């Protein structure tokens, strides 16, 4: 029970730190995230028409 609680606490702490790093990267004005969002919308509409 102590080994399972230590593994669950380490996984919960690593997931909280990874979620904070992903939110801080999007607020730094990512030029690669804005160009990939426009190309993904045009490729999805061409496959359904």
């Amino acid at each position: 029970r102590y080994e399972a609680q230590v593994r669950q606490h380490e996984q919960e702490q690593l997931a909280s730190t990874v979620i904070s790093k992903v939110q801080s990267e999007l607020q730094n004005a990512k030029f690669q995230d804005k160009v990939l969002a426009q190309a993904v919308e045009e490729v999805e509409r061409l496959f359904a028409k």
């Binding site: 997931a15 804005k34 969002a37 426009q38 509409r45």
Partner: protein, 163 residues
């Protein structure tokens, strides 16, 4: 003639009842500008609004006030019959609902609607909706689009459910 737009059935049938008689001899273009003058001269005026929203007056007093204001505004065709039906049946308190439902019939049978993201879309008047939405989404994403979310919220909810 009944168009497929539903629009409720009781309260929304006020503008749909007069649209059948106005769709003859090309009389739908003059009804759009005449319906906007009746609501603009009652809302931002503070004169005929308080004298008509009360439960007083009579049947002949309500019909004489609508005919006197329509002779000096912009009403001479079938615009005078719309105000006389709402005066005898006590329906003058909801004049904004009858004018808003009349503009939705011309935009549905001669144009698109709905939305997409951020603000409004384009609402073209071509034919199909598949060939008009693909040619307007590429021209509107490049020009403008301040982007001031949906993909970041879906990725965070999937990681919390597996932990």
């Amino acid at each position: 003639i009944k168009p497929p737009v539903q629009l409720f059935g009781l309260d929304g049938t006020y503008a749909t009842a007069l649209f059948s008689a106005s769709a003859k001899d090309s009389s739908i273009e003059k009804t759009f500008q005449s319906v906007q003058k009746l609501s603009s001269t009652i809302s931002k005026d503070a004169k005929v609004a308080q004298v008509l929203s009360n439960p007083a007056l009579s049947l002949n007093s309500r019909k004489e006030v609508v005919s006197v204001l329509s002779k000096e505004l912009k009403l001479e065709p079938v615009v005078s019959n719309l105000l006389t039906v709402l005066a005898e049946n006590n329906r003058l308190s909801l004049f904004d609902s009858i004018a808003k439902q009349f503009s939705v019939l011309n935009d549905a049978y001669n144009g698109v609607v709905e939305a997409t993201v951020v603000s409004a879309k384009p609402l073209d008047s071509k034919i199909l909706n598949r060939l008009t939405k693909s040619i307007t989404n590429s021209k509107y994403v490049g020009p403008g689009k301040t982007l001031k979310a949906s993909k970041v919220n879906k990725l965070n909810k999937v990681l919390s459910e597996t932990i």
